[PDB]
Structure of Mll3241 protein:
Amino acid sequence: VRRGDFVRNWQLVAAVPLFQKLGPAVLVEIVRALRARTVPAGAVICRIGEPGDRMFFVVEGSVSVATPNPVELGPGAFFGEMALISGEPESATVSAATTVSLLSLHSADFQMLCSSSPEIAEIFRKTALERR
Amino acid sequence: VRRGDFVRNWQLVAAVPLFQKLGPAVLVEIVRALRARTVPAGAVICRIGEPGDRMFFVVEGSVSVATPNPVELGPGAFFGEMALISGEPESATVSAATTVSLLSLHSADFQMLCSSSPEIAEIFRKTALERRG
Ligand SMILES: Nc1ncnc2c1ncn2[C@@H]1O[C@@H]2COP(=O)(O)O[C@H]2[C@H]1O
Ligand SMILES: Nc1ncnc2c1ncn2[C@@H]1O[C@@H]2COP(=O)(O)O[C@H]2[C@H]1O
């Protein structure tokens, strides 16, 4: 990881309350694994039916989940967790509702996070079930 | 280190350009060792003749170095390096000029910083000589 992206991530990570549950050591691992991304309003982030190799956290702006009755997720929310939990394809297309700032986490690092944090693992699990 | 202090340190170290010379791994060890402090305007930070066991980095506000002609140091500046390098007592009293936000580093962690970053070590050494002369 480059120093520029790393230090930038620390500022971005503050926008996701979920990570307040991590101690310094685990926080560093997650911050090292996260990748910042800006998506313009209306643009596809993930597509229904596709294999999920990563999940996302919303920093700023919002996204639109294309369920029958679409759901708009805001800062602090996460999406892409269902496929990572079930192994099944992406259950819905998710697009930028407004221009959105994101933090992406790959499946391997997602697993490491859940292994490191029982509390966070269950939040993902309950949220996925609630969404299913 | 507490999670709160750790996370707050990341925001504060951004104000110290010197630390841009550190990669992610060394940066973490430094952020772990730093302690944040706010000092009210006019209040003593360093005392002349006192043994040096730590140094400081200015995050916000400014400090006044009590040399014959006082020097006001601003954000990104450092002080207390001279005693740590030479082993001599503090060369001058340093006080908050305005209310100041600081980051302090103990002597043991100063050694770690200098070893991890010989570039930074050189800045300290040259600056110390400059301030000495
Ligand atoms: N009913 C729902 N409410 C909110 N978000 C959802 C819902 N269904 C799916 N999503 C999100 O959209 C994502 C699409 O990819 P995933 O199935 O991996 O994970 C999904 C959830 O994060
Ligand atoms: N001439 C000077 N100009 C600027 N800063 C100084 C000067 N002399 C001393 N200092 C700073 O004040 C500090 C007092 O403690 P130290 O001697 O350990 O380190 C000193 C320097 O950081």
About this structure: The CA atoms of residues 25 and 44 of chain B lie 34 Å apart. Helices of chain B lie at 3-13, 24-33, 81-86, 107-116, 118-132. Chain B has one domain: 1-133. The domain at 1-133 of chain B is CATH 2.60.120.10 (Jelly Rolls).
